[PDB]
Design a protein around this ligand. Sequence first.
Ligand code: NA
Ligand code: NA
Ligand code: NA
Ligand code: NA
Ligand code: NA
Ligand code: NA
Lengths: 134, 134, 134, 134, 134, 134
Amino acid sequence: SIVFASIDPRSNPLQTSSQNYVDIPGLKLDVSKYSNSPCLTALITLNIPTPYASGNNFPGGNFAIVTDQGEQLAYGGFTYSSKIPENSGRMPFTLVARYSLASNVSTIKAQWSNIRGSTVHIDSYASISAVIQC
Amino acid sequence: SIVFASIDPRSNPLQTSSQNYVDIPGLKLDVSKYSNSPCLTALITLNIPTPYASGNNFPGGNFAIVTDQGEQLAYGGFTYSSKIPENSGRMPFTLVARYSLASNVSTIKAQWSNIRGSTVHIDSYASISAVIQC
Amino acid sequence: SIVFASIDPRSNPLQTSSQNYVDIPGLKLDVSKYSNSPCLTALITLNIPTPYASGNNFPGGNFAIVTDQGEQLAYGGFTYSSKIPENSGRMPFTLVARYSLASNVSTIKAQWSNIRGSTVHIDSYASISAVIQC
Amino acid sequence: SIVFASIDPRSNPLQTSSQNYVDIPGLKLDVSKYSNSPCLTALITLNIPTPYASGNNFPGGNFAIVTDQGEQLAYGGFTYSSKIPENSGRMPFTLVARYSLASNVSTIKAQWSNIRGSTVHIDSYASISAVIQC
Amino acid sequence: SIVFASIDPRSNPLQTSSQNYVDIPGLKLDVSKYSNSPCLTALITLNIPTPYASGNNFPGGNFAIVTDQGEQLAYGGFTYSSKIPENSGRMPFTLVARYSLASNVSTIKAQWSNIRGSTVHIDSYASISAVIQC
Amino acid sequence: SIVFASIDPRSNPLQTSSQNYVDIPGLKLDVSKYSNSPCLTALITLNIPTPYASGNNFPGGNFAIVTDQGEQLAYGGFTYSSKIPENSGRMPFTLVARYSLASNVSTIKAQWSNIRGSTVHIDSYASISAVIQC
Ligand code: NA
Ligand code: NA
Ligand code: NA
Ligand code: NA
Ligand code: NA
Ligand code: NA
């Protein structure tokens, strides 16, 4: 089966300058119906196709897939190749994780954080999805 | 089930300088067999791992997943961090969408468009795929 | 069903300066249980979310999905937009392939290679996965 | 998926002397979750392994699988080979039906009726089940 | 998935006095779409809930599930407990078989034959079905 | 998926005169691969299409589906309509059960027992099968 959530915050863009990971609002999957099911697994893709980051010390952004049981299932990020890019170019980002559904998991969700004092931005379509299989 | 199409236009590369979205030839999925099926959903991934864009005003490229019912299911793109990059570097791009198969859909396909008068280029492997589940 | 492998080589990073494709250790899928099954197909995603490449001639990195039957199912890569980037920025990369399981396949795996004498680096989470369906 | 209901009325046996079909209490399947799903079908088995019928004019019993939309999906029955059997022997009975789940169906259930004024009896395990597939 | 066929020959009943197995018309499954698929198996149920047999030497009827490759996957039958039953009572019959779909099979079908010169009769609902799984 | 076992003891028929349930040799399903899986269920059919029973006090036979955890999932049987049938006619028998695979189950199997001092006989094809679903 498929579980899916997307956002498209054109009118009210998202940003973070947080050094710690914080939730990306709207990018959460409810997997309660499948929990406590050791024979099931979720393959989870976080797709942030058009992010950027502003800043003045080799800016970038980090992303993670986590559960509400404190498991960091995957992480990664982008950075620029200059200290102060004259344009914060759009840097497509995708991240793929796996999680057994054996445990009492309820939520699989996206988080983000900054790098070197940057501000990370999302102002367009992004998604999180899972394929759940036996 | 899986539906899949790929291209690999090494000998005859693809390009667009179109401001409006136009089809990427060869990156189309036929989902007719699954249409009018409200209990089915497709999770669709467009993978353009090695595109670039030429131009002189912060060039880039945009991509979309659409149906032949006029639904834009997802969009995003890449841009460079300089006004006139001395090399149009390869900027891997992936985009993930979801579509209920309730409607009379026949085709799910990839489109692209330019940015600020750029020319977008594909000269190597790219794919579009879907997982269809109940 | 889902098949999955990941790495997270923070303490002992990976690198290659190989012009020919070589295996990324740890990014291998065992599909033996599904082989010789013409009604089955694998949809395979290689996710390298945080690679970079060092070098002095427009550096970058290439990646491929292959089988142990010599099939190159997909390939692509990233490159920088400068001859000698002052920072080798992190360039998220994903690649999606399809393979019929009709043949006597045992292994689907990731490979990488350099570009123009670069060194490609992985020092954090990366994965390879497949959805196997009828 | 599987939907299932059984009864085992040892302490309070069931009987009917009804000429018209009437519900067998407890032998009902709730298929509401799957309704309005044209791509789904149910394969339904009614298993009455140990019924009998009393009477004096070639007794027997009839059974049917029906929906709450007035569809009689299957029917059949047993009869004895004598006008007045000296023992109403146990006559195992099974019945298999198919139903598309396209419609607004809620319930698939078992019914029974008599033959030639008989009384039909169930005093032990019986079941109704469905396999639901795409 | 489910494959299914039924008959309900109330207006034009079926009979056989054949000593050799012959096809029951209408009780045939087309499995061509699944053939040459070693990872698939069919679980096949033949349900004849209300047959009888006439005759004067301990009459009965035999049934079989066969393919068009000459495989007899299952067989069985009913007989009466008297030499000349005064009423040929209805004797519910079900038969379950399994078949790998590895081979070039096209058809799985029902057959019947007599016993000791009997005539076997079907004048009401009967079905043949399969569940096909990986 | 399907699990299946059959017997066809033409050359060396089976019989029991046991008052207690005893295993029918060969009619056992190994479900170990699916055990400890609360999201999975088995729908189990025992098909004895051509049994009979000998004896002189309203003979018959009983059958059950059991696990190796002492669960009697289903039971039923046939009996004749005379005290001493002049021919022990063939009395087709089918029995359907359901079992959650949550527990540490290894085996689902068929048992039989006599009635009123009868001897129950199987000298031809019989099967036990399960459909296992999520
Ligand atoms: Na939840
Ligand atoms: Na189409
Ligand atoms: Na292998
Ligand atoms: Na209902
Ligand atoms: Na055919
Ligand atoms: Na076992």
